[PDB]
Amino acid sequence: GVATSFSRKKARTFDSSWNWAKQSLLSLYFEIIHGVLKNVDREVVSEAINIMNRSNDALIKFMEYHISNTDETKGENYQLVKTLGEQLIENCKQVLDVDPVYKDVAKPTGPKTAIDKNGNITYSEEPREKVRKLSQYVQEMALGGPITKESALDKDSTKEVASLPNKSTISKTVSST
Amino acid sequence: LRAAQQQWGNDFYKRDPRIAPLRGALATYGLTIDDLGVASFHGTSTKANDKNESATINEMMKHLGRSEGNPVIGVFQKFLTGHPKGAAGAWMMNGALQILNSGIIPGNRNADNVDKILEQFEYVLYPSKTLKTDGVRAVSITSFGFGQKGGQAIVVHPDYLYGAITEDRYNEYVAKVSAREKSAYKFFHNGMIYNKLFVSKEHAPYTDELEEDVYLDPLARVSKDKKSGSLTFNSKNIQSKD
Amino acid sequence: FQKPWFATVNGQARDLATMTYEEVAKRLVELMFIRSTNSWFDVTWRTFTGDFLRRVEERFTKSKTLSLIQSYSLLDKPDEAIEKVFNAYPAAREQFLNAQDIDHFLSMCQNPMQKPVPFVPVLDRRFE
Amino acid sequence: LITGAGKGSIGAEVLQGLLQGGAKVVVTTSRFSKQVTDYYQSIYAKYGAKGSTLIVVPFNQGSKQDVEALIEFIYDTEKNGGLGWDLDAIIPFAAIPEQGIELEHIDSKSEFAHRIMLTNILRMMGCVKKQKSARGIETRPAQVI
Amino acid sequence: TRGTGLMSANNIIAEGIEKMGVRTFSQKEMAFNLLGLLTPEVVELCQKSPVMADLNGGLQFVPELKEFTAKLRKELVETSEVRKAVSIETALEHKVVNGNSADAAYAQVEIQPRANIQLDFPELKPYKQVKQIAPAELEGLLDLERVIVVTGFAEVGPWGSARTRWEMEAFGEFSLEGCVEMAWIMGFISYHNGNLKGRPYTGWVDSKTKEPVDDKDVKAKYETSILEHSGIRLIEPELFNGYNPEKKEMIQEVIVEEDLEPFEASKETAEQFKHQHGDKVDIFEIPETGEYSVKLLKGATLYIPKALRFDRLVAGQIPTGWNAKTYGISDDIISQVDPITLFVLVSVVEAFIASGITDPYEMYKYVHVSEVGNCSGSGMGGVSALRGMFKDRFKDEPVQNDILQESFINTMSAWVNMLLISSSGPIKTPVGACATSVESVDIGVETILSGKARICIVGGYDDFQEEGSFEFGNMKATSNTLEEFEHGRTPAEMSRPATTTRNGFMEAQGAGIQIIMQADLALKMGVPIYGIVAMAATATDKIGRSVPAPGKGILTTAREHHSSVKYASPNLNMKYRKRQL
């Protein structure tokens, strides 16, 4: 067990985000044009975050070209990606010189055990009915339960992308609830 | 006519010092410099070569005023094959052709972390995964050898040729291909399962009596021999007035 | 002669290698099925044509799929069965027979447990 | 720093977040191999945000020499083949599973496990304390989760 | 926490626990909880006193959790087993009532894929579609005898042929068609047709075991073998005449200090030793046999084989089991020529195939025999021959008398002509080391533009061999494999262009061949057209003293005068040109 594994010469560095940005835009841009990704998928909003977090001038120029040279006549996909591009350029221009933010936008899931008529047991991660966002996940965690007492996502991602940089002011805290 | 087509369609830039031999060769088929989508790099994976290549291509694109934020997509084939010295370009060319007639730009899967120095080169993108584009229009193959050998070659998508011909001639061609493609496919599978793709010729198409006769007649062709079933020069189709 | 040269399409002499999969299947139904009685002359000939269609499907399928010809009884309406198989695999209308599918066809032609085929499929040693 | 961030683990999702948040992260792997470096490159190329660095190093928490060598590697100046970093957080999730081993069955494996999940944690904390006290770093304490 | 799926951390009973109004967490949720603890507010908090975060999700409030989880699991298990023991009874009752004939109609026929390896010709669009991409002015503008199109390409290399190489370069894995072809290339399967175990059979078999293989299985059975023996990998000594970079044979000069045990040598061999050593050797006939005795004396000169350890243990090598005989090349050729000349012949035949031309003579239906050139070339030529004339002649091993011919760089071009093409076209073999294959395409174009040839076969080829790899590792041009092992790099990840840690190039072997033609000719012959060659150029760099130092010569292919760029030239306008035509 106690054999020495570590050595300095085996350290792998990764610090070339400036390059991976442009690939990550270009992949998204072609995923949308081929229709691997749709306007309803959360995966689009994720990629936007992961692109905005990597924004610089060089990226904004690379978007400005690849979007302004897209011919929306060539199909519904090309109008979709051209609308989402313009949004994404505006978002990256705002958050240029802002700090990069860990924001999850995935679908919170709950366990689901199904026994069929034959008796085969299947597990699945079904989207929770009540909680659909991390913002609602927090509120659920706040309220606890009866036992703990003592004595635009999924419909229009393009809109949800627009609302990423706009720091939403918490009117009243979830602590108070 | 041909010389007239040459002077305007083909070789309009061979004297003009305001047109770069790269710009011209793309402009011939009504492509701007912004249409060179992919650059196939030598990319040996040596300290010196990879930085000097990237600097070169970045300076070509920057001089020819390729639009900001429109970098060529570098493809480094040699991560997979290794560098076979003299055959290196001829692999890259094959790769370029495959890229053109697929729209797929492969990704350097060993590009763990692109060297920080290469950031200074705006016009060069170093992808680490295959990208299925909506089409490439032109590919730049660049090599650098020992002894200051330095090459480049552009390769333009074949569909910009068919522009140049009429509907009738196109249609004749498409027919003739679809027929050859089928014959070739046949000959390929036959060859592969009976180990006879390669068939060394035992004879020249001409007999040693006709050798000189065939060399000296510029319009001498081969015609299907009825007995042997091969292609051979007949003595009636050499210095033939017809 | 009573056994025509199989690889004919529209009275033009060809070979097995220069015929498409469609053109083979049609020529099987042309020679081995009867129009007047609207029934396969033999039973083993129906089987031989099915075994050729399931070979086609094998050659042009991309993954493990369920054969359109589940039972050879469906061939009792042959032109529909052809249309249905070459609509699933429209590539086989234009591609010529693979050299493997020529060798499998000629190995089926010399099946001992079937009525001989009514055609000469090749000129070689076994032409006699 | 974060140990026990293998694929399909809590660590991995923590790492994702950190990179996405611009953190400079030194992740460790027990089973260093092509497949693992290729995965971590994929992660960083997806998520890794501007001014985020990811260092993947092979590392057997169950060895005392490896712990000391790692912490020396993080703190050594770049000129001495280190990183010359001052850790802000340490997340030692490294573990090995034990199952069906009640009191009477405690043997080699259980003692080794204990050495990864306790003793060597205390050694890392130690080594971090010794490198931070060596360079008189007093106002940049390393949060241990 | 809910790790992966089903079994892991009892995910199946997780929903059960949630019923009691406790929360179980996905990894992403529990990761969000932990990252909360690095937010400024908790950090500055943790700096004052220790912080005990509880992310338990209220599970601490369930009494006797152990037996309560065990209970839930027991109810899922006993409900799954009861519904299995009822479904198996109902199945049996069906099978007894309906026998094996009503329950035989439920069994469908599965089709299993065959490999249908396509030649991958370029797809031609309908005329309306191809008319839209080019400017409308182009029609009748170009001299289609001055437009060089690529009509056919192939290669032979670490990943097999162009086809397979592409699949590996694009999709990181083989299809069915790839796996088959790679198998067939590497010999893992031959094709049988006739009697097998008496019974008639048609299709692939294993080559070793003569066992029937089906196409669906060829991936499962030989993927690992194929991936392990293909590409960049450890040098195999079989493929290079027992060359082992671990034990690289040298010799070493010693002065003999004490007489040697006299030994047997034929008259000629003895007299050869006598002419070499002079006084330092004593020869004596042995009357009985007529065979001579040789004795080395003090002060003589002897060569002791040693053995060195070279540190370049990895190289991109043609797949183990590649064999010219497979493609149909005869043994009388394979014996006679350098292995490089096999890679070239197989590249040329396979490039013609890809071009649609099966019988090269077909090309002389449309052109004169003086019009099909071979502008291909090599950087280093037949290095197996050179080793066979410089080392294996010096060591009086039996080498063919015509080794010199085989060594010459142009010979591979010649051997194509002699076996396949039988042209009388221009024959220009360029030597440009790494750039050769591009210098070739440059020559080819110019040869066709000049009018001397209507078709040229361009490309490069180089073999890899002991003496090359050793001299590349001395210059420090190649990667040092012991440095890469210290860095944990497996072979497969030692060629890493544009990366930070690149230190040296992986050396490989094989050929690439293209067929270039005039567009007009190509259209007339009806050969596929994989692209136009818009431009090819070479360029030397500048005055220096480091031959391997790459320069910025090629930059000259973008020279243009920008002093008068105020009003765009009418020459760059396609309507203008078309009008003037």
From Swiss-Prot, chain A:
For the modification Phosphoserine, the affected residues are S135
Disulfide bridges in this chain: none
Source taxon at top rank: Eukaryota
Record PTM: 4'-phosphopantetheine is transferred from CoA to a specific serine of the Acyl carrier domain by the C-terminal PPT domain. This modification is essential for activity because fatty acids are bound in thioester linkage to the sulfhydryl of the prosthetic group.
Record's miscellaneous remark: Present with 17000 molecules/cell in log phase SD medium.
What's the subunit arrangement here? [Alpha(6)beta(6)] hexamers of two multifunctional subunits (alpha and beta).
Q: What does this protein do?
A: Fatty acid synthetase catalyzes the formation of long-chain fatty acids from acetyl-CoA, malonyl-CoA and NADPH. The alpha subunit contains domains for: acyl carrier protein, 3-oxoacyl-[acyl-carrier-protein] reductase, and 3-oxoacyl-[acyl-carrier-protein] synthase. This subunit coordinates the binding of the six beta subunits to the enzyme complex.
Provide the family line.
Answer: Belongs to the thiolase-like superfamily. Fungal fatty acid synthetase subunit alpha family.
Q: What is this protein called?
A: Fatty acid synthase subunit alpha
Originating species: Saccharomyces cerevisiae (strain ATCC 204508 / S288c)
User: Which gene is transcribed and translated to give this protein?
Assistant: FAS2
Report which part of the complete sequence is shown. 389 to 629 of 1887
UniProtKB/Swiss-Prot annotation, chain C:
Coiled coil ranges (UniProt) are none
**Top-level taxon in the UniProt lineage:** Eukaryota
Q: What else is known?
A: Present with 91800 molecules/cell in log phase SD medium.
Give the protein's function. Fatty acid synthetase catalyzes the formation of long-chain fatty acids from acetyl-CoA, malonyl-CoA and NADPH. The beta subunit contains domains for: [acyl-carrier-protein] acetyltransferase and malonyltransferase, S-acyl fatty acid synthase thioesterase, enoyl-[acyl-carrier-protein] reductase, and 3-hydroxypalmitoyl-[acyl-carrier-protein] dehydratase.
Q: How does it assemble?
A: [Alpha(6)beta(6)] hexamers of two multifunctional subunits (alpha and beta).
**Which family does the entry's similarity section mention?**
Belongs to the fungal fatty acid synthetase subunit beta family.
**Protein name, please?**
Fatty acid synthase subunit beta
State the organism named in the record.
Answer: Saccharomyces cerevisiae (strain ATCC 204508 / S288c)
Gene name as annotated: FAS1
What fragment of the whole protein does this chain represent? 899 to 1026 of 2051
